[PDB]
Structure 1
Amino acid sequence: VINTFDGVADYAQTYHKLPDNYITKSEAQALGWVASKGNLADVAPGKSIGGDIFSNREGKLPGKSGRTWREADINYTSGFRNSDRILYSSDWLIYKTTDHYQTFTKIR
């Protein structure tokens, strides 16, 4: 697998977690992922990067006391990472970005 915008948005709002095919950046690194070589598919077959906290430093996503944001890669299959991400809050608002976190739009 579930790696589409609708597939993971509906799965996260329902189960309140990411599907089994996601791994954190540090989990991927421990397994041998080298970002400069775009080898994720070779060292962790069937997996995508997801679940890391997104700081939202630049304040583009709506804030609230106690709300924290997490991100997940969408549409990834192999090669270097793409620029599609799903942003989900602790209160399950879901936003999408297709331009490397430049802009976001609400999807759930």
Structure 2
Amino acid sequence: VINTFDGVADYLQTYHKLPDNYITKSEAQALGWVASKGNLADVAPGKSIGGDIFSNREGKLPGKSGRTWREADINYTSGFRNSDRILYSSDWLIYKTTDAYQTFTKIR
């Protein structure tokens, strides 16, 4: 039940488990999440999408000898998403972006 940059990072750097309130895009999409609808508050009155899997081959985020990269929605309540998004790696390195996946400022 968390949706804030530092809070999600802190949770991951401390508990390593994805904040009890996230779901992979696939799950969200398969659960019924539809673009031409934004249904979420109904089936999930306070849940944020996030927890997918990416290799970062495109090198858009910190890398090394094999790096794992994953993202998560941030600043959500009941309705649709926004531009606030947090990125976390295998090594738990966290970066924040508020322009809808555009600028990745580091936070942890």
Question: Cα deviations across residues 4-55 of structure 1 (Å, max 9, x unaligned)?
Answer: 1111110001111211110111111222211221111112222110101245
- Contact kept? 2:46, 2:76, Cα under 8 Å: no
What is the correspondence of 1:64-103 to structure 2 with a 5 Å cutoff? 64-103=64-103
TM-score, with length taken from structure 2: 0.89
- Contact kept? 1:39, 1:78, Cα under 8 Å: no
Which structure 1 segments of 5+ residues have no match? none
Q: CA–CA distance in 2 between the matches of 1:57 and 1:78?
A: 33
More deviation, 10-19/59-68: 59-68
For 2:36, what is the secondary structure of its paired residue? Answer: helix
How many angstroms does 1:60 deviate by?
A: 2.7
TM-score, with length taken from structure 1: 0.89
CA RMSD of superposed structures (Å): 1.5
How many angstroms does 1:83 deviate by?
A: 1.3
Which structure 2 segments of 5+ residues have no match? none
Q: CA–CA distance in 2 between the matches of 1:96 and 1:53?
A: 17
Moved over 6 A (4+): none
Q: How many equivalent pairs are there?
A: 108
- Contact kept? 1:50, 1:73, Cα under 8 Å: yes
Percentage of pairs with the same residue = 98
What is the correspondence of 1:1-108 to structure 2 with a 5 Å cutoff? 1-54=1-54, 56=56, 58-108=58-108
